[PDB]
Amino acid sequence: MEDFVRQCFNPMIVELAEKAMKEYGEDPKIETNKFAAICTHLEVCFMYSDGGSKHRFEIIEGRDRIMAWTVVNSICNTTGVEKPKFLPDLYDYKENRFIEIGVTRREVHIYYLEKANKIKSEKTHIHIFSFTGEEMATKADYTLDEESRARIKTRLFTIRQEMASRSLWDSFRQSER
Amino acid sequence: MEDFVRQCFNPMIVELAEKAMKEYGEDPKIETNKFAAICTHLEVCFMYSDGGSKHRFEIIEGRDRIMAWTVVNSICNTTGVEKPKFLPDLYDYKENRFIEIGVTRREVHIYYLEKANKIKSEKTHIHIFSFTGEEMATKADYTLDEESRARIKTRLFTIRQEMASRSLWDSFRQSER
Ligand SMILES: O=C(O)c1nc([C@@H]2CCCN2C(=O)Cc2ccc(Cl)cc2)[nH]c(=O)c1O
Ligand SMILES: O=C(O)c1nc([C@@H]2CCCN2C(=O)Cc2ccc(Cl)cc2)[nH]c(=O)c1O
Ligand SMILES: [Mn+2]
Ligand SMILES: [Mn+2]
Ligand SMILES: [Mn+2]
Ligand SMILES: [Mn+2]
């Protein structure tokens, strides 16, 4: 499964995911399922920022903490949106709202509630994807057009199928907590 | 002039420029002209990666060293372009070449020769801009359309004029070495 992650995600995603695990004292060579999960969430974030206009989305995830907070504070100073308590994943210029992105192997609506009851931010939007293609977001607002969204689930499904082809999906489907 | 830099470039550029100076033991509060010069070169790089298609350009400048080399090595492994000796500023997918970007207050052709005689990379392209609007590149190839290029010189001219309005341009025009 370690080899699979490296042959599945581009090297910039791999590097980003290892740094994040090491920053928390976890070994990518060992927590291979968390490894893959960080990569997938990272790749989905890059794809969300790709739908819509060329500059619709400022991306927060994947930057070091200092730059990440530099972006968010800069947006709050210019537009006046409330400053989130936690680093969210993107900013949506067209709609004036921070976005949180979740990717779960579990059921989509439970993960919604989990990250709703902990976000406590009125003006931060939650958008959740599954590998089985069930997506769940806030106030029934899903931001991107069905076409951008479809490309993301298709990518997520494609990951699922090759993990299964290498017989990794079952263990990857249990590890989540 | 310190205040001018902060009121002229977006906070992400300021932060990036301070980190680079501190990484070399220079004080942004003191070397205020180098400060502005790092910011301008950074902003021009972001604008070059903006002309052309949405994904024409992979950007190298502005990333930490590890990620920066992660990008370049990843490109060389996939396409087979020669691996540069120094970190360049962008990659051009449409043309299969690394780009170096220079911004000078001095004369454009001298800076071309300076960064040609030190690059020693056959397959790295040099593109130089001035605040007075004179631009100079390799093999007379200038990559972007006249329209993207014009927007960059217009921005550069606009910087020059407000430095002059605050009477900073003359000292900023001498400091370069
Ligand atoms: O979408 C999500 O679930 C999501 N969750 C997080 C959680 C909560 C804050 C810390 N954290 C980590 O994951 C850091 C970490 C990274 C690697 C390991 Cl081994 C362990 C932890 N942070 C997000 O930015 C985010 O988008
Ligand atoms: O375009 C250019 O002139 C250009 N020049 C450089 C030079 C050569 C390599 C180091 N360096 C610095 O500037 C680091 C530095 C940053 C701040 C201070 Cl205070 C001093 C030095 N590096 C580029 O990436 C680049 O694009
Ligand atoms: Mn995040
Ligand atoms: Mn997230
Ligand atoms: Mn550079
Ligand atoms: Mn440069």
* B57: CB partners within 8 A, 6+ apart: B48, B49, B50, B90, B91, B92, B93
To test the contact with chain A by mutation, choose from B9, B12, B13 the residue with the greatest count of A C-beta atoms within 10 A, namely B12
- Structural domains for chain B: 1-177 (3.40.91.90)
Q: Which of A11, A54, A64 sits opposite B70 (nearest CB)?
A: A11
* B26: CB partners within 8 A, 6+ apart: B34
- The residue to which tokens 């902990």 are assigned: A118
Smallest Cα distance from B54 to chain A, Å: 7
| Helix B32-48 / helix B11-22 crossing angle, nearest 10 deg | 120
Name the amino acid, one letter, at A130.
S
**Minimal CA–CA distance to B15: which of B5, B25, B24?**
B5
Q: Which of A34, A94, A115, A120 is catalytic?
A: A115
Residues in chain A: 177
CA angle B113–B130–B10, rounded 5-degree value: 125
Asked if B147 and B94 touch (Cβ cutoff 8 Å), the reply is no
Q: What experiment produced this structure?
A: X-ray
| CA distance from start to end of chain B | 19
DSSP character at residue A33: H
According to DSSP, the residues that pair with A97 across neighbouring strands are A92
Secondary structure of B40-86 as H, E, C letters = HHHHHHHHHCCCCCCCCEEECCCCCHHHHHHHHHHHHHHHCCCCCCC
CA distance A163 to B170: 62
Q: Which two tokens stand for residue A7?
A: 């042959």
CA distance B79 to B10: 34
Say yes or no for a CB contact (<8 Å) between A74 and B16. no
Q: Ligand 6 mean position to B87 CA, how many Å?
A: 9
How far out from the chain centre does Cα A74 lie? Answer: 22
For B53, counting Cβ atoms within 10 Å of its Cβ (0-12 exposed, 13-18 middle, 19+ buried), the class is exposed
Give the other-Cβ count within 10 Å of A60's Cβ: 24
* A75: CB partners within 8 A, 6+ apart: A58, A81, A91
Pocket of ligand 1 (CB under 6 A): A 20-21, 24, 26, 34, 38, 41, 61, 87, 89, 102
Q: Which two tokens stand for residue A121?
A: 């931010």
Q: Which ligand 2 atom is nearest residue B17's CA? A: 17
Asked if A125 and A173 touch (Cβ cutoff 8 Å), the reply is no
Give the other-Cβ count within 10 Å of B167's Cβ: 9
Ligand nearest to the CA of B88: 5
Chain B, nearest residue to A77 by Cα: B11
C-alpha distances out from residue B9 to A54, A96, A120, B106, Å: 21, 22, 33, 22
Give the other-Cβ count within 10 Å of B142's Cβ: 15
Q: For ligand 1, atom 4, which residue shows the shortest CA distance? A: A102
* B6: CB partners within 8 A, 6+ apart: B14
B101 is in an annotated binding site: yes
Annotate B65-100 with b (16+ C-beta within 10 A) or e (fewer): eebbbbbbebbeeeeebeebeeebbbbbeeeebbbb
Say yes or no for a CB contact (<8 Å) between A73 and B11. yes
- Beta strand extents in chain B (DSSP E only): 57-59, 90-92, 97-104, 124-130, 136-137
- The residue to which tokens 């029934």 are assigned: A140
